Amino acid sequence: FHFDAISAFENYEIEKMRDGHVVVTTKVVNSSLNYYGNAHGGYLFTLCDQISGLVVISLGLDGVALQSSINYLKAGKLDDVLTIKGECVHQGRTTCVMDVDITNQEGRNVCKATFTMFVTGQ
Amino acid sequence: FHFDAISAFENYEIEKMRDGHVVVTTKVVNSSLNYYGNAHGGYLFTLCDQISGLVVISLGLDGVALQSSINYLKAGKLDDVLTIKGECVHQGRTTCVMDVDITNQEGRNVCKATFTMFVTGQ
Amino acid sequence: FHFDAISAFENYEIEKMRDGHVVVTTKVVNSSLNYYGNAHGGYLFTLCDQISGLVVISLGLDGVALQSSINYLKAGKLDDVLTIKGECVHQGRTTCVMDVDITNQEGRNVCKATFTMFVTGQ
Amino acid sequence: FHFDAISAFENYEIEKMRDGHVVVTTKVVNSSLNYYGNAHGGYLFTLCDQISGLVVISLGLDGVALQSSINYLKAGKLDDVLTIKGECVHQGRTTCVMDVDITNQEGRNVCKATFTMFVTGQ
Incomplete structure (x- = not known):
């Protein structure tokens, strides 16, 4: 019947963002x-x-x-602090594949995802 | 370097919610x-x-x-009006599978998703 | 330690194959x-x-x-007779998406799959 | 109109099979x-x-x-020699998740898959 908006990244820290490697905490x-x-x-x-x-x-x-x-x-x-780690695991001529994992502050694995993208260009 | 929060359902209308069939617009x-x-x-x-x-x-x-x-x-x-339609396509003893489609106001298909869930109970 | 080869389509009947619609039994x-x-x-x-x-x-x-x-x-x-039904649910300029369902001879749903393909050409 | 059966593991070598770690070549x-x-x-x-x-x-x-x-x-x-490597990346009370990668004899990555399974028991 009723539910509140779902929001993401109302806070975040970019820890690493370099050459296909990304770490972000929230x-x-x-x-x-x-x-x-x-x-x-x-x-x-x-x-x-x-x-x-x-x-x-x-x-x-x-x-x-x-x-x-x-x-x-x-x-x-x-209050969990989630560490989000992304990597490009395949860089093709026309597509990319990204693997992304989330771990909490206790080091426990929360979720794991894979993204298949089309390269619009440079 | 910087990006805004991503938010969902800051507005919505539940059009249908009955017996495994759901339609919501936003x-x-x-x-x-x-x-x-x-x-x-x-x-x-x-x-x-x-x-x-x-x-x-x-x-x-x-x-x-x-x-x-x-x-x-x-x-x-x-300003697109997105119609979100959900259906349970398989109700198992211990799991459910949901198919969900989004169409815009012109009737064009925007995205399509499948959810595999575990039934915690009744 | 040991297992036999897995084989598929050692028998099949193409029932329909026309304009993005396919039905095959096995x-x-x-x-x-x-x-x-x-x-x-x-x-x-x-x-x-x-x-x-x-x-x-x-x-x-x-x-x-x-x-x-x-x-x-x-x-x-x-000895199950499986009916395999395929449809293109999205034909894009550069990609296609196919939905495929299998039902057995009792009409029960066996499995359901989605294929995202790149169009090599005409 | 016509196509041959697709077969898998008409040949294989189990290189490793121990405690959630598996390597097989074919x-x-x-x-x-x-x-x-x-x-x-x-x-x-x-x-x-x-x-x-x-x-x-x-x-x-x-x-x-x-x-x-x-x-x-x-x-x-x-004639490619494919190395198939499997790992359980999550062992839950009631489900398991397996990641499996295939590389060819030149070390190139061929495909990558993820399996979500239900534990029938011990």
């Missing part, structure tokens, strides 16, 4: 959560997708989304 | 967009994921995310 | 099965992938695989 | 190929899926397939 807040008080499925995905986009930028490329996949491994909670 | 606004002025990949995913969650609720179930997939077909733009 | 035999006597995960995928390839051919296109996804819904068994 | 032969003389999409998937199944066995578990994904990176060719 703290889980109330707008990150679903009904059950866990990190929203869309929120966690958006975290990964954005970092994927940064990997692409870091390569001097312009990209457009094609297909994306995600596995949910462990719930995120309010 | 208007694309500035917080929905990426750098290039298109609907953000995470935004479109979050739209689908939330409606998937509603399909599950509409069945009287509690669900937890496992794996999710999305295909991006056509860009969303500022 | 009977599950011993070489289709895994250790537990169910239709092998790779076998069911191969069934879908091949029919996806036929959808592409039926459109007068040449395609190359990019990314593919599958959901397993119900086990296939020896 | 040589690409004529029955592995599609129309265009490349390794068939279903063939490469079947290679990965089978090794995923071995990872699960190596853990003393019984598994059933749920959802699987694959990215195709570079074509396989006749």
Whole structure:
């Protein structure tokens, strides 16, 4: 019947962004959560997708989304500090593939995603 | 270097929510967009994921995310009205599978996603 | 330690192959099965992938695989007659997306897959 | 109109199978190929899926397939020696996630897949 907006990156720190390697941290807040008080499925995905986009930028490329996949491994909670790590695992002539993982402050794996993108150009 | 928060469902209309069938509409606004002025990949995913969650609720179930997939077909733009349609395509004893599609106001297909969930219970 | 080769399409009937629409039937035999006597995960995928390839051919296109996804819904068994139905759900300038479903002789849904392909040309 | 059966593991060597780690090699032969003389999409998937199944066995578990994904990176060719490497990247109470990669004899990455399985038991 009613639910609040889901928001992502109301806070973040770019730790690394260089040559296809990206690390970004963010703290889980109330707008990150679903009904059950866990990190929203869309929120966690958006975290990964954005970092994927940064990997692409870091390569001097312009990209457009094609297909994306995600596995949910462990719930995120309010006040968790999530470390988002992106890597380009395949750079093709016309496509790129990015792998992105999220771990919490205890080192536990939260989710893992893969992004298949089309290279719009340089 | 810098980017704004990505937000989803700052506005929405639930048109249908009954027995595994869900339709929700929303208007694309500035917080929905990426750098290039298109609907953000995470935004479109979050739209689908939330409606998937509603399909599950509409069945009287509690669900937890496992794996999710999305295909991006056509860009969303500022002021687009996006119609989000969810259906449970498989209700298993212990898992559910939801298909979710988004179409714009011109009837064009924007994206399509599939959600594989674990049934936490009734 | 030891396992037999997995084989697909040692028998098949093309029922329909026209303008992006494909239906193919096949009977599950011993070489289709895994250790537990169910239709092998790779076998069911191969069934879908091949029919996806036929959808592409039926459109007068040449395609190359990019990314593919599958959901397993119900086990296939020896002597099942599996109906494999393929459709192009999106024909883009440079990519295609195919949806493929398998149902058994009792009308039950066995698996469902999605193929994202690159158009090599006409 | 006509096409030959697609077959997988008509030859193979298990190099490693221990505690969630699996390496298997196989040589690409004529029955592995599609129309265009490349390794068939279903063939490469079947290679990965089978090794995923071995990872699960190596853990003393019984598994059933749920959802699987694959990215195709570079074509396989006749006489290629493909090295298939599987790992369990997440062992949950009720599910497992396997990552599987294939590289050819030149060290080039051919494809990469992810398997989400349900643990039937011990």
